[PDB]
Design a protein around this ligand. Structure first.
Ligand code: GSP
Ligand code: MG
Lengths: 192, 145, 125
């Protein structure tokens, strides 16, 4: 994070992580769609022609004011397909909080676990520890018929009873819940 | 995140370096961005232009070049140049976590830009050479949205 | 498959460009970030990472150009110490990456990159 005392601005970086097609970019598109002009910048989306994220999405968001400092949250999503790993590592630099977006389809459970170990690895390799940073997990795609139960995703993905949110990103369900949860964990960390 | 703070002591000098370069090198815009994407300062005709997006693409570009330089066994390319027919753009790494960016009209020779940039960068490392949370409570946080 | 025919002909263009410009290595990268072809000294280089960082760099540069009222910047030249790196967009979808040591001039690489581009733009057609 970066605090400009002169301009009274608190800046925090939040990165959405998870496997390919799991819904990271849909989270940001929803947030952008529903936020008044006066609290958001422009949504940058570096994507392929089939809309897969190729480098990152970026959305700057202002969440109000705490003790007369404006809060600016810099939201990123990574490219989730395995072979973008080199680009994916770049986005984690200076991350203040992480949202891990998991796809609830049984056919993507192993992609979820692979992506989660990839987030642990990538953080360790630049000197962070997922067990020690503000972290929430989103079980996205709860609408789909082939979605596994919340309890089986907890067993596969969530060992420290990290805050977990059910979402259906395209309708917005769970999206602002997830953002509010990691944003407050980040702000609680600074308070310490 | 490394908890980083900037008091108006060093902010005011950094802004001064920037508006020097836009006036002298006839830059259309100037700005300073952390490697992690955080915009630190801008300067120039930043009306009608999104310096927050610019800072984010810049740090993404520099980080991708960073990894490529490392892949072909080199160090981070100290700067990058990108000519345009109308407006052109030059950037250089200032220190270990900062990037200075200048885009200018091509009615301003490249030689004059890399001149003022030799000094402004050297000036910036001279500046780098030099609490809201204490009274905060969890209602301040919970009441944010 | 006539894909077998095209893909050896793509390697041909890359191989000719590596010799005719005295380069170290040549990569042909889709804007998708997937490697299309590679000629030259590739043994000690992760080619998945290189394709991914190359597509990411071009995408970032593009989004930036689009902000400051300029079309996508066509070429990037990033001179290093013992080596150099040149990049060009061939047509719409492909990025050509030429890494060459400093005993080679950028002006020859660009001269040779012109004809490789057309040889590639017509292989695609
Ligand atoms: N049914 C259903 N579809 C969803 C849900 N969330 C996202 N999708 C769909 O899945 C597809 C992928 O979403 P997207 O946000 O682009 O994935 P991503 O995580 O950003 O993917 P990538 O950039 O790593 S490849 C889109 O078609 C999107 O509409 C969901 O909650 N329920
Ligand atoms: Mg995406």
């Amino acid at each position: 994070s970066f605090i400009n005392y002169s301009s009274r601005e608190i800046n925090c970086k939040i990165v959405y992580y998870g496997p390919g097609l799991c819904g990271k970019t849909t989270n940001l598109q929803y947030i952008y769609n529903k936020t008044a002009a006066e609290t958001k910048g422009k949504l940058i989306s570096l994507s392929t022609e089939t809309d897969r994220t190729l480098f990152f999405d970026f959305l700057p968001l202002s969440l109000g004011e705490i003790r007369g400092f404006k809060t600016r949250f810099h939201l990123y999503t990574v490219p989730g397909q395995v072979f973008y790993d080199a680009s994916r590592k770049l986005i984690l630099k200076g991350v203040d909080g992480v949202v891990f977006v998991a796809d609830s389809q049984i056919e993507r459970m192993e992609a979820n676990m692979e992506s989660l170990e990839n987030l642990r690895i990538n953080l360790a390799e630049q000197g962070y520890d997922l067990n020690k940073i503000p972290y929430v997990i989103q079980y996205n795609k709860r609408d789909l018929p082939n979605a596994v139960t919340v309890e089986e995703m907890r067993k596969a993905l969530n060992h420290r009873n990290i805050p977990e949110y059910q979402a259906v990103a395209p309708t917005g369900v769970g999206v602002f819940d997830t953002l509010k949860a990691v944003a407050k964990l980040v702000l609680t960390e600074l308070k310490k | 995140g490394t908890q980083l703070v900037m008091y108006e002591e060093e902010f005011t000098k950094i802004n001064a370096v920037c508006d020097r370069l836009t006036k002298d090198a006839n830059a259309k815009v100037v700005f300073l961005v952390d490697k992690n994407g955080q915009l630190i300062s801008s300067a120039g005709q930043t009306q009608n232009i999104d310096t927050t997006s610019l800072a984010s693409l810049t740090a993404g570009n520099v980080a991708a070049m960073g990894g490529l330089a490392k892949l072909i066994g080199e160090n981070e390319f100290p700067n990058q140049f990108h000519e345009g027919a109308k407006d052109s753009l030059y950037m250089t790494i200032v220190g270990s976590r900062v990037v200075l960016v200048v885009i200018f009209d091509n009615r301003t020779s490249l030689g004059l830009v890399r001149l003022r940039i030799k000094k402004a960068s050297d000036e910036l490392t001279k500046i780098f050479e030099s609490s809201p949370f204490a009274e905060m409570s969890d209602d301040d946080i919970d009441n944010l949205f």
